């Protein structure tokens, strides 16, 4: 560790790889998101991890598409990235206001609409293909 810290070439190559910083957080958030998403699929995810999955999806659907295919963001991407966060937050806001909390109330199992998973992932893939 000490011969790495005082190393000139290590720091110089560190600065060489300092050139590529915005794309590293954009990819590590994907790993953190898939980890939290597997945990939420298992079912022990706190609300922070769920909003983190939401944030990772919104970043790679409204911050990344013009960060890679243009190399730079100005104008629309920040506005629509926050607009998605703003638009996801009515089923969460209403269901904290007109409820005690977000705790799932016991209900009739045939009321919730369920669809085959291949159709769901087909819809998601089509939506991303349209946005990209």
């Amino acid at each position: 560790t000490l011969t790495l810290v005082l190393d000139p070439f290590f720091w110089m190559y560190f600065s060489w790889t300092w050139l590529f910083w915005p794309w590293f957080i954009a990819v590590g958030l994907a790993g953190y998101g898939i980890y939290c998403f597997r945990k939420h699929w298992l079912g022990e995810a706190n609300a922070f991890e769920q909003l983190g999955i939401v944030t990772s999806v919104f970043t790679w659907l409204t911050l990344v598409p013009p960060a890679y295919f243009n190399g730079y963001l100005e104008g629309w991407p920040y506005v629509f990235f926050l607009a998605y966060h703003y638009f996801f937050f009515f089923n969460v806001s209403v269901r904290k206001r007109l409820y005690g909390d977000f705790y799932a109330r016991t209900h009739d199992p045939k009321w919730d609409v369920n669809t085959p998973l291949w159709s769901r992932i087909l819809f998601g893939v089509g939506i991303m293909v349209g946005h990209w």
């Binding site: 079912g43 022990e44 609300a47 269901r95 977000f102 799932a104």
Partner: protein, 50 residues
Amino acid sequence: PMETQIISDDTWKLVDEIWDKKVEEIKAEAVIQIEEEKKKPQILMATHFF
């Protein structure tokens, strides 16, 4: 004595049924009263959008 039998042998069965019902409910609720595993908020209720 002048007194023949009174209210019934049927409403005694009714009050015995009530007694037995409440006794079984108390006995059941004294054993399986606490089984709590997890309470995760459904802050991603997917049926609303997805």
